[PDB]
Write a protein that binds this ligand. Structure first.
Ligand SMILES: O=c1ccn([C@@H]2O[C@H](COP(=O)(O)OP(=O)(O)O[C@H]3O[C@H](CO)[C@H](O)[C@H](O)[C@H]3O)[C@@H](O)[C@H]2O)c(=O)[nH]1
Ligand SMILES: *[C@@H]1O[C@H](CO)[C@@H](O[C@@H]2O[C@H](CO)[C@@H](O)[C@H](O)[C@H]2NC(C)=O)[C@H](O)[C@H]1NC(C)=O
Ligand SMILES: O=c1ccn([C@@H]2O[C@H](COP(=O)(O)OP(=O)(O)O)[C@@H](O)[C@H]2O)c(=O)[nH]1
Ligand SMILES: O=c1ccn([C@@H]2O[C@H](COP(=O)(O)OP(=O)(O)O)[C@@H](O)[C@H]2O)c(=O)[nH]1
Ligand SMILES: *[C@@H]1O[C@H](CO)[C@@H](O)[C@H](O)[C@H]1NC(C)=O
Ligand SMILES: *[C@@H]1O[C@H](CO)[C@@H](O)[C@H](O)[C@H]1NC(C)=O
Ligand SMILES: O=C(O)CCC(=O)C(=O)O
Ligand SMILES: [Fe+2]
Ligand SMILES: [Mn+2]
Ligand SMILES: [Mn+2]
Ligand SMILES: [Mn+2]
Lengths: 706, 19, 568
């Protein structure tokens, strides 16, 4: 029952990185009394763990211990600060230490880092770890003073070999009662024991467990080249994420953008280096972001000769909108890495650079408040979570393979499907991030971050950002949008976006399908029945109608007119019209897909008890002109029902009429542009189209279910 | 792949008795 | 409710059904769901007979026979797990679970054909744990058991460092695991047990189509955890074979499970309602089979007679030459004289009496085989543990060596190799045989006529020593050259089997170790009784001491000696 007020955790941290703050939060969670040493001085050692180092910490500890050389009623714990998180309570630590009995416990690892020749001098150990590691130890004040008073070397001298040499002396070890934590009972090292640690969830806290010896450690030290595993462990242990408490430090430290002064300036950066679908929609959405236009500068980098007309058309709106706008064209022969480096150099060299919001053109930002939230989070680097539609692709990696490429992690699927919500720590983010300005200025003053290597620019950026010790956060609290699939893209078309019904269904639906279709499907009016058993609902918008008409007119070969046929197996038409069947233009499969997806469910709801597969054979577009051919004679159709969609406006471009039903004396006067006509066409509907006198009119027909 | 888990599955409540 | 799924299980049904009939649970609070199909042998007849005999006691019995057809179309053999077989197993188990829910019975115990539930209190001890899914840990002849400890990426075995401590019972209590199969127990009164489904995979299922991984995914998505715990011993189960073996291999596997039961427990008695198809022993194609046993020792001979009968082997039994009781009057009648300049190689004691009696019995057996002129014979002891496919492997090896032809005399079958070093030469154009070396433990050996004649001509009457140190002298492999110099001819060509076939039942410093020899009086005098050596045993085992670069991988292996599935 040792008093928990006699513990004193003392660490060393020259600066205040994110690792030191994480350790501080973990310690203050369980009520410990930490004292940091050397907060402000310069690191007079060398490389942190490349070859040697760490001789300044012993000197600092020796200088500090002079004030505790006489106290016996205190227990002193020494731990590295940048790569350690605590997972236990002070009372449990005290109980385990008292159970150990020794006056000094070190942390036992399985490797002999500095010197290899001393391997055989260590006392033998059956199962547990054998060697000694200086990353953490606990003992009484007098014994620690006796150990540390003998340090007299150069400031760059190594540290571990001194402790090892001191411990290997039998007489000294027996005199001062040294010992090691053989079975990982308090200190756990994540180097050589990565397959013995499992997360053990609980009601409101998370703890690690050692399966090999059935012990629960108190401190976790990710020494060696296993800092990424410790970063992964830090999302949960000890109060990061809990099964009933959501996230931990994932909603605080929020600016909330007060002051009345205009919000912090942001240097927008948009990069286009591939032929991407739906680019003009992205450009027109750029103006709709919720941020004042007198603060957001812009840097648009276009790297394709194919995308010049779109940006050239949309340029005046951007030039008027934002405060300052700069374009880099394709004629500069600029590699993508050089362009990204130039953008970061531009903002970094500008003292007004307060943030930096890079944004790839292959990123649809459904949420219009993403920028405000990401500025408000106040982290060094934070990225939203965008995921492909109906897949597990995303813009982050759960874990890293030894080849430094993608390697699947354990909870990637949980994060992708938003079963867990918070601000996670990941080794790789891409396609959208918000880097702070001062981080670019006084923490990464180097210029070449993307280029200068054979590797891809994104992996190079993430590697150079991880090597400096900066965390890459990733927030998936809200819905931030989706990614577009640009793997394949046929550009040899007048309007290539029309063929995108198989790759990006959602964006295709938003752009081409009529905006009132969903309401009509759900049944709040709109759909009309002007005559018995004929329906009138909207299907296509103006963009699809115009684009289809222009694409068909580009074909030119308006066949049709002769009673005999060559496109038909029978070889004889009952009634000829000038038409362009979709098989000739290659749009047949996409049209069948549209019929299967959108027309089907509505015609099922309209006529209850009817099940459709939307299998059609004949579908075409006809042109009615007073010169070439007049309207049609009364007839029937060889189908269950027919779909009659118009493709232009009445009066503006033609002066004619629609359909006339003989069995009901029903006449349709003014068909709309994107609206579709539905009616059975086999038995009880003897229809006949009206003639046109002025201009030309377009109609799309499809004899579905023959 | 790293850090295998031991999730919190608390014993489920019993069902109402049959009648 | 107890659910059984039987197919080609006629060999195993009596013993396991007798074991399951004696569960300490009231017979009026139990129901049956036997369901058999797709079988070759007459499992249906025996299952029907047992049902008809036992239908009265139990609450309600079900019966779903589907005799035709007798094989799946797109399968290579009875052990080929085609996708149709998987589908059928899914549907059958899901039907059993569904019929266990619409009947208002809590708990359901999924037992299969080959699992031998030995402890009568297994059901009560599993009920008294208050978990949804819990499965007892069943023993086996290898590291195989009925629980996993990790899934790699798509539902495949992975050895977690917490397996051997659990399986070898270095820890106890109930431990959460990601897989339990074979025998388990599902609670049907907890609310979370309403989402478990065997056949229909979850919509998010993307892994392979094995039948036991789909239930793990269903348990994981339904937020339940599967336990497995081994506070005491429960039963045994045989290791699965390859996907190209026959039914005879499976029968031999279950018979070896039956033998491995007896070595520390009373024999697994069969049921009463159905009987066992008693077998007719064969002579291995040998001439004789001798087994030297003491009349005073009666427990040892019964288990060995049962082992020989269960393996369909006769036994031309021979008694012994009681020696703890033989005095000098009859010791010196035959010229028995202790070897000049001999001692215990490990202690220094001159000689004991158990070795004298054992050597006398072996000498008499040798004399008999010489007199009657048997080409070959097999000699045994009282403490044996046969390996899997013992009979068939021995037949094949002996047929091979006889067909090839060479100067074999003393093919060893059980021995101990203390000479741990670089491996020994392998005889060409033969399989599973290696050249002999230094070895104690003459548990069993195949004597020949020529070898026996040479050994008798050596005339070992005036040289007394233990047989395990005798035999290495006569083929020029003993370390010390003084004893060899005391002898004249070493024309013996001994051999051995690299995949050893017979091991002793009890090692030194273990439970139940009683040795007729070693702990006795000296060959002379009557007041020096050496005790059983506790610290200076020196005969523990040559298995852990061989866990090094022993190699011996250049040998040619028979098509047998290959088994196991995802677990080892
Ligand atoms: O048509 C049928 C009817 C019943 N059974 C029964 O299914 C069980 C399978 O046991 P085996 O001894 O044939 O095989 P395994 O040891 O390979 O079984 C283990 O692995 C299998 C493949 O993974 C299954 O999952 C099975 O549940 C698991 O115990 C036996 O009771 C058998 O009678 C069938 O196989 N097929
Ligand atoms: C087996 O476990 C269940 C847990 O589901 C126990 O149910 C608890 O019963 C007590 C009795 O009053 C209730 O107070 C708890 O609320 C129940 N648990 C839950 C989660 O609701 C059940 O008692 C256990 N069986 C035994 C014999 O103790
Ligand atoms: O730029 C600095 C300044 C100080 N330290 C200190 O040096 C110690 C050793 O660093 P690390 O724990 O990263 O070392 P490893 O355990 O990998 O040798 C850390 O605890 C810090 O206190 C450092 O690593 N880098
Ligand atoms: O008076 C006798 C007669 C025979 N045996 C032999 O001893 C063997 C059994 O002894 P055990 O195998 O227990 O001794 P171990 O070799 O195991 O130490 C039997 O085969 C007997 O033939 C004996 O020791 N004393
Ligand atoms: C320890 O934690 C509790 C919980 O907040 C706190 O109220 C208590 O005062 C703490 N003890 C110390 C020494 O601060
Ligand atoms: C969709 O319907 C609404 C009805 O409120 C109408 O105002 C709007 O113009 C329609 N959209 C069209 C015709 O494109
Ligand atoms: O022009 C129309 O609306 C009628 C034409 C028609 O349905 C047909 O031509 O089959
Ligand atoms: Fe028509
Ligand atoms: Mn460290
Ligand atoms: Mn089995
Ligand atoms: Mn014995």
């Amino acid at each position: 029952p040792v008093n928990p007020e006699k513990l004193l955790v003392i660490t060393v941290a020259t600066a205040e990185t994110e690792g030191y703050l994480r350790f501080l939060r973990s310690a203050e969670f369980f009520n410990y009394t930490v004292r940091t040493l050397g907060l402000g001085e310069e690191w007079r050692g060398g490389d942190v763990a490349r070859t040697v180092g760490g001789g300044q910490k012993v000197r600092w500890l020796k200088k500090e211990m002079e004030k505790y050389a006489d106290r016996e009623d205190m227990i002193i714990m020494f731990v590295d600060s940048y790569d350690v998180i605590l997972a236990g309570s002070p009372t449990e630590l005290l109980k385990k230490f008292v159970q150990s009995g020794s006056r000094l416990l070190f942390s036992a690892e399985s490797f002999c880092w500095p010197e290899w020749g001393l391997a055989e001098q260590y006392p033998e150990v059956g199962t547990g770890k054998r060697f000694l590691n200086s990353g953490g130890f606990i003992g009484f004040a007098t014994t620690i003073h006796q150990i540390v008073r003998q340090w007299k070397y150069k400031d760059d001298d190594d540290d571990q070999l001194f402790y090892t040499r001191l411990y290997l002396d039998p007489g000294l070890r027996e005199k001062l009662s040294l010992n090691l934590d053989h079975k990982s009972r308090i200190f756990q090292n994540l180097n050589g024991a990565l397959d013995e640690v499992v997360l053990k969830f609980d009601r409101n806290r998370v703890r690690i467990r050692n399966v090999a010896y059935d012990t629960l450690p108190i401190v976790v030290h990710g020494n060696g080249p296993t800092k990424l595993q410790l970063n992964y462990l830090g999302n949960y242990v000890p109060n990061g994420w809990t099964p009933e408490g959501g996230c931990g430090f994932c909603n605080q430290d929020r600016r909330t953008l007060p002051g009345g002064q205009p919000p912090p300036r942001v240097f927008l950066a948009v990069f286009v280096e591939q032929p991407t679908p739906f680019l003009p929609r992205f450009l027109q959405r750029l103006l709709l972001l919720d941020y004042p236009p007198d603060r957001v500068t812009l840097f648009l980098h276009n790297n394709e000769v194919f995308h010049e007309p779109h940006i050239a058309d949309s340029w005046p709106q951007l030039q008027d909108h934002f405060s300052a706008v700069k374009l880099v064209g394709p004629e500069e022969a600029l590699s993508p890495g050089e362009a990204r480096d130039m953008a970061m150099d531009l903002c970094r060299q500008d003292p007004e650079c307060e943030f930096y919001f890079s944004l790839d053109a292959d990123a649809v930002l459904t949420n219009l408040q993403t920028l405000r939230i990401l500025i408000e989070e106040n982290r060094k680097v934070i990225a939203p979570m965008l995921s492909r539609h109906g897949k597990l692709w995303s813009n982050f990696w759960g874990a890293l393979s030894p080849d430094e490429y993608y390697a699947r992690s354990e909870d990637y699927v949980e994060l992708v499907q938003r079963k867990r919500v918070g601000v996670w720590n990941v080794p790789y983010i891409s396609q959208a991030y918000v880097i702070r300005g001062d981080t670019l200025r006084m923490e990464l003053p180097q210029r070449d971050v993307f280029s200068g290597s054979d590797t891809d620019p994104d992996m190079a950026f993430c590697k150079s950002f991880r090597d400096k010790g900066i965390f890459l956060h990733l927030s998936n609290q809200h819905e931030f949008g989706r990614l577009l699939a640009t793997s394949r893209y046929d550009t040899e078309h007048l309007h290539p976006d029309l063929w995108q019904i198989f790759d990006n269904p959602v964006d295709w639906k938003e752009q081409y399908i009529h905006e009132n279709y969903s309401r009509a499907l759900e049944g709040e009016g709109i759909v009309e029945q002007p005559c018995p058993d004929v329906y009138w609902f909207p299907l296509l918008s103006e963009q699809m109608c115009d684009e289809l008409v222009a694409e068909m007119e580009h074909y030119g070969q308006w066949s049709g007119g002769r009673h005999e046929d060559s496109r038909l197996a029978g070889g004889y038409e009952n009634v000829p019209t000038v038409d362009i069947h979709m098989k000739q233009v290659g749009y047949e499969d996409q049209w069948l897909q549209l019929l299967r997806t959108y027309v089907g469910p509505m015609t099922e709801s309209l006529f209850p008890g009817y099940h459709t597969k939307a299998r059609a054979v004949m579908n075409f577009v006809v042109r009615y002109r007073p010169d070439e051919q007049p309207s049609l004679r009364p007839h029937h159709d060889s189908s269950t029902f027919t779909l009659n969609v118009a493709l232009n406006h009445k009066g503006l471009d033609y002066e004619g009429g629609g359909c006339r039903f003989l069995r009901y004396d029903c006449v349709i006067s003014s068909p709309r542009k994107g609206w579709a006509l539905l009616h059975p066409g086999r038995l009880t509907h003897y229809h006949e189209g009206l003639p046109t006198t002025w201009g030309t009119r377009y109609i799309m027909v499809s004899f579905v279910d023959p | 792949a790293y850090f295998p888990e031991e999730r919190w599955s608390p014993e489920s409540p019993l069902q109402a008795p049959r009648v | 409710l107890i659910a059984l799924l039987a197919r080609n299980a006629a060999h195993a049904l009596p013993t396991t059904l007798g074991a399951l009939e004696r569960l300490r649970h009231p017979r009026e609070r139990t129901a049956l769901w036997v369901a058999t199909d797709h079988n070759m042998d007459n499992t249906s007849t025996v299952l029907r007979e047992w049902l008809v005999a036992v239908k009265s006691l139990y609450h309600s019995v079900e019966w779903r026979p589907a005799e035709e057809p007798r094989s799946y179309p797109d399968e290579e053999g009875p052990k080929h797990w085609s996708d149709s077989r998987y589908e059928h197993v899914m549907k059958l188990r899901q039907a059993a679970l569904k019929s266990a829910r619409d009947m208002w019975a809590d708990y359901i115990l999924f037992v299969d054909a080959d699992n031998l539930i030995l402890n009568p209190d297994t059901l009560s001890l599993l009920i008294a744990e208050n978990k949804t899914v819990v499965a007892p840990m069943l023993d086996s002849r290898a590291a195989y058991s009925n629980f996993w400890c990790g899934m790699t990426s798509q539902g495949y075995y992975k050895r977690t460092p917490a397996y051997i401590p659990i399986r070898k019972r270095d820890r106890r209590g109930c431990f959460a695991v990601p897989m339990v199969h074979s025998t388990f127990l599902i609670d049907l009164r907890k609310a979370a047990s309403r989402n478990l489904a065997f056949y229909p995979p979850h919509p998010d299922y993307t892994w392979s189509f094995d039948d036991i991984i789909v239930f793990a995914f269903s348990c994981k998505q339904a937020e339940v955890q599967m336990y497995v715990c081994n506070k005491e011993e429960y039963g045994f189960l045989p290791v699965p074979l390859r996907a190209h073996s026959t039914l005879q291999d499976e029968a031999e596997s279950f018979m070896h499970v039956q033998l491995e039961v007896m070595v520390k427990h009373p024999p697994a008695e069969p049921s009463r309602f159905i009987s066992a198809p008693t077998k007719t022993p064969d002579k291995m194609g040998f001439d004789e089979v001798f087994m030297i046993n003491l009349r005073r020792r009666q427990d040892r001979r019964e288990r060995m007679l049962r082992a020989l009968q269960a393996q369909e082997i006769e036994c031309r039994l021979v008694e012994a030459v009681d020696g703890k009781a033989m005095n000098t009057s009859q010791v010196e009648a035959l010229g028995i004289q202790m070897l000049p300049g001999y001692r215990d190689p490990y202690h220094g004691r001159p000689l004991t009496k158990g070795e004298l009696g054992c050597f006398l019995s072996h000498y008499n057996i040798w004399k008999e085989v010489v007199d009657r002129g048997l080409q070959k014979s097999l000699v045994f002891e009282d403490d044996l543990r046969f390996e899997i496919f013992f009979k068939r492997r021995l037949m094949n090896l002996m047929r091979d060596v006889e067909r090839e032809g060479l100067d074999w005399d003393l093919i060893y079958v059980g021995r101990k190799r203390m000479q741990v070093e670089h491996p020994e030469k392998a005889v060409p154009r033969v399989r599973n045989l290696v050249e002999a070396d230094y070895s104690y433990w003459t548990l069993a050996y195949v004597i020949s006529l020529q070898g026996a004649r040479k050994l008798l001509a050596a005339e070992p009457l005036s040289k007394m020593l233990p047989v395990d140190e005798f035999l290495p002298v006569m083929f020029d492999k003993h370390p010390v050259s003084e004893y060899k110099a005391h002898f004249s001819l070493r024309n013996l060509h001994a051999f051995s089997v690299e995949p050893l076939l017979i091991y002793p039942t009890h090692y030194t410093g273990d439970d139940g170790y009683v040795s007729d020899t070693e702990t006795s009086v000296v060959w002379n005098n009557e007041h020096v009784k050496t005790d059983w050596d506790r610290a200076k045993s020196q005969k523990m085992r040559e298995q852990q001491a061989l866990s090094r670069e022993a190699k011996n991988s250049d040998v040619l292996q028979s098509p047998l000696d290959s088994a196991a599935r995802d677990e080892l």
